Amino acid sequence: MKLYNLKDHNEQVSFAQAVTQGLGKNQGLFFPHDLPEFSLTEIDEMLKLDFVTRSAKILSAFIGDEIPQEILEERVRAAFAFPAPVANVESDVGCLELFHGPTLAFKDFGGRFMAQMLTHIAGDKPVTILTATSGDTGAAVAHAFYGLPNVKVVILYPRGKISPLQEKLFCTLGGNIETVAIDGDFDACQALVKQAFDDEELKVALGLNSANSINISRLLAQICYYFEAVAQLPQETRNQLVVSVPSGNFGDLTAGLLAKSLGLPVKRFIAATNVNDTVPRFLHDGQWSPKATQATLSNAMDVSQPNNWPRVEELFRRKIWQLKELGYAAVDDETTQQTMRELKELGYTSEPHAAVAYRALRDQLNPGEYGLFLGTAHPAKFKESVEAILGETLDLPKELAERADLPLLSHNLPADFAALRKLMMNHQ
Numbered sequence: 195m196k197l198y199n200l201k202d203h204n205e206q207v208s209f210a211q212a213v214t215q216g217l218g219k220n221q222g223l224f225f226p227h228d229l230p231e232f233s234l235t236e237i238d239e240m241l242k243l244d245f246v247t248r249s250a251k252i253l254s255a256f257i258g259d260e261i262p263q264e265i266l267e268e269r270v271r272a273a274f275a276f277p278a279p280v281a282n283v284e285s286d287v288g289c290l291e292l293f294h295g296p297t298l299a300f301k302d303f304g305g306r307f308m309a310q311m312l313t314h315i316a317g318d319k320p321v322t323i324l325t326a327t328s329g330d331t332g333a334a335v336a337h338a339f340y341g342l343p344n345v346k347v348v349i350l351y352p353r354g355k356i357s358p359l360q361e362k363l364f365c366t367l368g369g370n371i372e373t374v375a376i377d378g379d380f381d382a383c384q385a386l387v388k389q390a391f392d393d394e395e396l397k398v399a400l401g402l403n404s405a406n407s408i409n410i411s412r413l414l415a416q417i418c419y420y421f422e423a424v425a426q427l428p429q430e431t432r433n434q435l436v437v438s439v440p441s442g443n444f445g446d447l448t449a450g451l452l453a454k455s456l457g458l459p460v461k462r463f464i465a466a467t468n469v470n471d472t473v474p475r476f477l478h479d480g481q482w483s484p485k486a487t488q489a490t491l492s493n494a495m496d497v498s499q500p501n502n503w504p505r506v507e508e509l510f511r512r513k514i515w516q517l518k519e520l521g522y523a524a525v526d527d528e529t530t531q532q533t534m535r536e537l538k539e540l541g542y543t544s545e546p547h548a549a550v551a552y553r554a555l556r557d558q559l560n561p562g563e564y565g566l567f568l569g570t571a572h573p574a575k576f577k578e579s580v581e582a583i584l585g586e587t588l589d590l591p592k593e594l595a596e597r598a599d600l601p602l603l604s605h606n607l608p609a610d611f612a613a614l615r616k617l618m619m620n621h622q
């Protein structure tokens with residue numbers, strides 16, 4: 195496979211280099227040099243294969259000769275140790291549940307997949323994985339790389355800006371895990387991570403790399419659950435599919451488009467965000483003006499500067515698609531709560547993030563079309579809110595319960611790269 199820096203089309207790297215390097219020069223994201231296209235027949239055939247084998251093929255389509263599809267099947271079978279079932283919410287709406295993994299969030303798929311690739315590509319090479327999180331990614335990465343003798347992870351997250359349970363899920367591990375509560379929002383956290391890649395001294399010293407969607411391995415793996423979703427739907431709807439994706443940093447939606455660019459039939463995509471509507475407002479007047487981040491019920495989506503947006507623009511550009519074809523909507527918390535109330539009424543328990551997607555989908559799903567909204571995380575990860583918003587008690591899954599009472603081990607640091615750099619050089 196070949197990749198290029200969105201900031202420098204001449205700076206190119208293979209899949210192996212992209213996976214171990216993470217970021218390109220000048221903090222630029224890597225983009226697939228070639229956009230493979232399966233045929234209608236192949237697509238039709240892939241959908242009949244089991245989840246694991248299908249995912250392997252999709253991935254091989256990009257990776258190419260670098261890694262034999264056979265080996266790729268083994269690594270994927272190890273990573274995707276859980277399903278991605280579609281739950282019928284309404285007669286014309288389905289919810290792609292992506293929280294059946296070890297951390298109850300879709301970050302599990304790409305998180306574990308990357309772990310597999312890195313260990314396969316780099317083996318036991320000493321590596322420091324610096325990742326920024328707004329709630330879920332941190333947990334998926336912390337668990338995916340826990341115990342790996344050659345690996346040491348450092349997660350940055352906005353202090354007090356994520357849910358209690360989300361924090362407990364990855365800030366009470368210790369050992370191989372190191373967590374940092376930054377005095378700022380997610381954006382500042384991601385900026386600090388990216389900034390670390392301009393520090394040649396630091397990169398080489400710690401063998402820097404990132405598990406955020408920044409890493410091509412993260413992006414690609416997420417393309418797989420879209421196919422799995424369609425494969426569960428009846429042929430009848432296969433040509434009238436509308437997918438709503440609760441977006442924050444937009445890595446999920448990006449993977450959705452890539453799936454379509456591969457040949458997966460998707461009538462229309464909807465980018466559902468919360469009050470942090472930098473994208474929605476952009477798609478409306480073409481003016482890019484991010485507002486200061488605002489903490490909401492869907493904290494994992496409190497992103498004002500989606501780092502993956504450039505990857506979406508490049509895909510539309512190269513695929514020759516018109517952005518006006520992209521559905522979008524900004525949902526506030528009041529609407530979120532009431533939307534959660536509705537879903538419960540319909541007989542489906544959901545949470546803030548998924549509610550935002552459903553709201554946009556429900557308000558844009560035309561007759562004759564089947565709608566899908568991604569359940570990006572288990573509602574229990576936001577027990578407090580869900581209980582008070584739904585007015586009903588909620589039991590805690592084993593994955594959360596076994597760490598709800600454990601002590602936090604997070605360090606506190608201001609939004610200063612100098613402070614972070616020192617702490618990292620103190621916890622080698």
Ligand SMILES: O=C(O)C(=O)CCCP(=O)(O)O
Pocket residue numbers: 301326327328329330331332405406407408412442443445446494495
């Ligand atoms: O951190 C989280 O839980 C996010 O959903 C957003 C940004 C991280 P990503 O780049 O891995 O998607």
